């Protein structure tokens, strides 16, 4: 049957919001809401070879702050800070010159156990004509070796160019979806294949959060260092 | 298919004549969820009973309701064609409840005037074993007596 979004079921209890701002009026609540979606989509659609895991947005009456986590930030940084200037101009055109931006790339730790880049890698493999069975298994084994709990991958679509759509799942371990205390990270991606669209869904279990609180604490960014800059 | 017996809510002792049964009939004549209205209607009928019968209203009400109370109950049991009925002894709780339901049902159909006098007349007409509720009790009793043979087989 149908299931409630795993990310959406855990918001406001154990998971913080990706955008944290309070608008002035119901007219300014819509502009500030579509614009941040454009920024997030920009980061995700293009600049994909970087493995951007999550982009957070922080806005005040007039000051915009962006916290961008990536696995390989060299591509964003570019050759002696070139590509970086380009993206700043991109961000300024979307929000406006009248405001103040404080974009912040922040390098990420433990990149494997994140459902976003795994789905992106999965989608790239399917688009690259890689056999589906082999592609998921290599991603599954590497993620488990990274030192996490069970992972559930559902890859539904016109499998292998077939005319009848199927779906292949591969769970390997305890994925307690009905439990609220668990840390389940979820992401979904659309692999654009020449024979249509492939939907990949990745459920990852990253332990149990036994410390009550609406997070305010990082998630799989702590193990190695996490810095770099571009801020003020 | 249930295997559980339902609980029972309290009946409450009446607030005037301290005769529980008054609260039950109040709830029976209830319509539109008006507790207030129903009490007024019923209580007014006892006052009319005083003016007419010159006797204690609680005693008259018991003499009417106790006389209306049936003894046998006919439960429908179909096998192949129609239903052969089965007379069974009804419990004491259901005896009072069925009596009250009939009293109210024939009271809201009399040719009389405001339901105060309507309901007042039915109870006074039932204390002398000559009314509409009596006939209903008579009919079911005679039907059970006629269908005495199948009483042994119930299910």
């Amino acid at each position: 049957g149908q299931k409630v979004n795993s990310n959406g079921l855990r918001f406001g209890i154990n998971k913080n919001w990706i955008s944290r701002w309070t608008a002035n009026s119901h007219a300014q609540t819509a502009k500030w809401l579509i614009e941040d979606e454009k920024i997030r989509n920009l980061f995700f659609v293009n600049y994909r070879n970087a493995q951007v895991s999550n982009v957070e947005i922080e806005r005040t009456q007039a000051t915009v702050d962006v916290f961008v986590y990536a696995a390989q930030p060299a591509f964003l940084i570019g050759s002696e800070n070139k590509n970086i200037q380009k993206i700043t101009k991109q961000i300024k055109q979307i929000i406006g010159r009248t405001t103040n931006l404080d974009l912040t790339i922040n390098e990420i730790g433990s990149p494997m156990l994140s459902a976003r880049i795994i789905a992106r890698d999965l989608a790239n493999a399917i688009e690259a004509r890689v056999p589906l069975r082999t592609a998921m298994r290599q991603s599954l084994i590497k993620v488990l070796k990274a030192g996490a709990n069970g992972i559930k991958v559902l890859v539904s679509g016109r499998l292998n160019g077939a005319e009848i759509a199927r779906d292949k799942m591969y769970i390997e371990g305890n994925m307690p979806l009905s439990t609220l205390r668990a840390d389940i990270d979820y992401a979904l991606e659309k692999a654009q294949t020449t024979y249509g669209v492939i939907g990949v869904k990745v459920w990852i279990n990253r332990g149990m959060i036994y410390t009550k609180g609406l997070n305010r604490t990082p998630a799989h960014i702590l193990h190695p260092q996490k810095k770099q800059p571009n801020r003020q | 298919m249930r295997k559980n017996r339902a609980p029972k809510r309290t009946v409450l002792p009446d607030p005037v004549f301290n005769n529980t049964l008054v609260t039950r009939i109040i709830n029976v004549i209830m319509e539109d969820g008006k507790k207030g209205l129903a009490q007024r209607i019923l209580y007014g009928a006892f006052d009319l009973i005083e003016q007419r019968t010159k006797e204690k209203p609680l005693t008259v009400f018991e003499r009417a309701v106790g006389n209306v109370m049936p003894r046998l109950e006919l439960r429908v049991r179909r096998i192949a064609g129609s239903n052969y009925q089965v007379p069974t002894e009804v419990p004491q709780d259901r005896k009072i409840a069925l009596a009250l339901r009939w009293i109210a049902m024939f009271a809201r159909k009399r040719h009389e005037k405001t339901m105060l006098e309507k309901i007042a007349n039915e109870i006074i007409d039932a204390s002398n074993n000559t009314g509409a509720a009596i006939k209903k009790k008579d009919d079911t009793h005679k039907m059970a007596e006629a269908n005495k043979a199948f009483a042994h087989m119930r299910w």
Partner: protein, 54 residues
């Protein structure tokens, strides 16, 4: 706010969302520069909203 889950049909299946505006009050009697100057370095986390009324 109540929103229908389904895209096309089945109005009956409709989920719900909430947004709570938690509120607090705090009235200061006398402040003076000694407090006001220290009030400049507070840095209130974005989420909290101030209604300073003087």
């Amino acid at each position: 706010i109540t929103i229908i889950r389904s895209p096309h049909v089945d109005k009956a299946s409709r989920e719900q969302f909430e947004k709570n505006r938690h509120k607090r009050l705090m009235i200061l009697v006398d402040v003076n520069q000694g407090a006001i100057d220290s009030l400049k370095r507070i840095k209130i986390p974005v989420g909290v909203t101030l209604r300073f009324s003087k």
